[PDB]
Amino acid sequence: DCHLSDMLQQLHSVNASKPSERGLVRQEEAEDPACIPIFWVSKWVDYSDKYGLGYQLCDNSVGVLFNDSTRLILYNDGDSLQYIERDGTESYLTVSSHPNSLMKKITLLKYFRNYMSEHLLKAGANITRLPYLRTWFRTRSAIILHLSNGSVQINFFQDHTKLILCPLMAAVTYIDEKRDFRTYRLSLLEEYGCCKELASRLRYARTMVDKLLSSR
Ligand SMILES: O=C(Nc1cccc(CC(C(=O)O)C(=O)O)c1)c1ccc(C(=O)c2cccc(I)c2)s1
């Protein structure tokens, strides 16, 4: 159990309040820079049909969630490896030590690494323990990223709008079409309201988070 239970409480409360239909809306008053996320997914590559999912964190680290449900992570120095089993047990390595065991998986990771650097661009670049990708799925409209620190990210394909939900600080960071990185306290959104756009994706978020809960 990550903090999805209670992520759901935060969203149910925000949506039940209907921040879209509100007399005077001052979305700006709902912002709070003390809730700015440290980690989010900046790039991702779906290759589940074969290997699994590769992604890049905003800290320039790269991970891969394989079809066997193990995760390999390369740190920002390009040498340190962290490996997480199904069981969630961790162990640490370096590429340079050339471990026989992970040779096949290290190689696949490096492949994702290169693709991402060559063909993909940094989502939320302008902005100032390392988690892993616990689980993920995509709809026809979005891809849903569940990190091990409890945060859940939703990326909407059509217009490149992203949500980062942070259960701990009870927060949400919304990246709009103009690529503006605005962070809000979910509770303050109830009070001050928000625009129809954001209020609809918070709804979608809840449906998605609920979908994460019934698929453990
Ligand atoms: O570098 C590789 N492909 C590549 C190398 C040189 C030139 C091209 C042609 C190139 C192109 O047509 O622009 C492309 O398809 O990327 C392919 C690959 C590196 C990894 C590949 C994998 O087998 C791999 C395995 C797991 C995940 C991923 I992304 C890729 S192939």
Domain extents for the chain? 1-41+131-216, 42-130
CA distance linking residue 66 with residue 109, whole number of Å:
10
Residues whose CB is less than 8 angstroms from the CB of residue 178 and which lie 6 or more positions away in sequence, other chains included: none
CATH architecture of 42-130: 2-Layer Sandwich (3.30)
What's the 157 CA to ligand 1 centre distance in angstroms?
A: 23
Surface-to-core class of residue 163, CB atoms within 10 Å of its CB (0-12 exposed, 13-18 middle, 19+ buried): buried
| Residues 83-92: contacts with CB under 8 Å, at least 24 apart | 84/132
Strand partners, 162: 155, 175
Q: Is the CB of 136 under 6 A from ligand 1?
A: no
Out of 3.30.1120.30, 2.40.180.10, 3.40.718.10, 3.40.30.10, select the CATH number for domain 1-41+131-216: 3.30.1120.30
How big is the chain by its Cα radius of gyration, in Å?
18
Resolution to 1 decimal place, in Å:
2.7
Matching fold, domains 1-41+131-216 and 42-130: yes
For a mutational test of ligand 1's pocket, the pick from 115, 117, 119, 120, i.e. the residue with the most ligand atoms closer than 8 A to its C-beta, is 115
Q: Is the CB of 66 under 6 A from ligand 1?
A: no
